[PDB]
């Protein structure tokens, strides 16, 4: 399944939260490494880029078939600022549109552990817009679940519409291991 994925990564201060041993930062690093490797092993023609969600969004790596560069550029990501989920997602959509290979499915997996402070109306509008441009926004929730779970359900339900298994939500309030939670998840299971 020829795939182009964008891994959005929160690097807000709340990643200083240390529920996931040893730290949320190292946990998300391990999870992104695992998911990128899983995407690459299946049909290596797939390409993966990476986005940093900080005070202002950034794209650390565009769609590439390699994973070591993405790991290396993420390793130096430190917790700073606050998350801007909407801008991060829009940047991800722009990167998907600009991807060199037009024969790929459009996926965006977002490590979004944070309280998403955005307006619900524009939120649902963005979700529907992405559904229109045929995007699959998988969302990994680890953090303020009590706050963002309903909004993430809105994300995924609006994206799916009817029978739309493209977009998925995986929430992990418990913190045994983020990497293991991700590997034993529906998103990576189908690959």
């Amino acid at each position: 399944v020829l795939e182009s994925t964008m891994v959005c990564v929160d690097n807000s201060e709340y990643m200083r939260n240390g529920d996931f041993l040893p730290t949320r930062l190292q946990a998300q690093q391990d999870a992104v490494n695992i998911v990128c490797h899983s995407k690459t092993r299946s049909n290596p023609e797939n390409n993966v880029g990476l986005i940093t969600l900080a005070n202002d969004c950034e794209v650390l790596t565009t769609l590439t078939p390699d994973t070591g560069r993405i790991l290396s550029k993420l390793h130096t990501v430190q917790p700073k600022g606050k998350i801007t989920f909407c801008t991060g997602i829009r940047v991800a959509h722009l990167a998907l549109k600009h991807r060199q290979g037009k024969n790929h499915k459009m996926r965006i997996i977002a490590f979004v552990g944070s309280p998403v402070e955005d307006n619900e109306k524009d939120l649902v509008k963005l979700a529907k817009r992405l559904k229109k441009e045929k995007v699959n926004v998988d969302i990994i929730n680890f953090g303020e679940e009590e706050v963002n779970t309903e909004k993430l359900t809105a994300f995924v339900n609006t994206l799916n519409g009817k029978d739309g298994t493209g977009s998925h939500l995986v929430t992990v309030p418990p913190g045994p291991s983020l990497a293991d939670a991700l590997i034993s998840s529906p998103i990576l299971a189908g690959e």
Partner: protein, 81 residues
């Protein structure tokens, strides 16, 4: 413990790839230098050596004198006059 395995797994998986990239595009750079150093050189002297980096006032065996602001591929091994 876990920190040891972390620094022996993730640090390794990143740093080894970094060194691999460096040592591959060093191969590319060295190959380009080797292609640009095509054999038919013009045997010449280093009559005078100056500094400003270093320079040269080489005396080409075609009874000619050429100042070089950049010495070039040579190792700058003191290149005595």
């Amino acid at each position: 413990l876990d920190s040891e395995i972390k620094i022996m797994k993730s640090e390794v998986l990143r740093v080894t790839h970094e060194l691999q990239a460096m040592k591959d595009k060093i191969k590319e750079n060295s190959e380009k230098i080797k292609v640009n150093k095509t054999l038919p050189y013009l045997v010449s002297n280093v009559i005078e050596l100056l500094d400003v980096g270093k320079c040269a006032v080489i005396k080409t065996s075609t009874r000619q004198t050429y100042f070089l602001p950049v010495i070039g591929l040579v190792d700058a091994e003191k290149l005595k006059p």
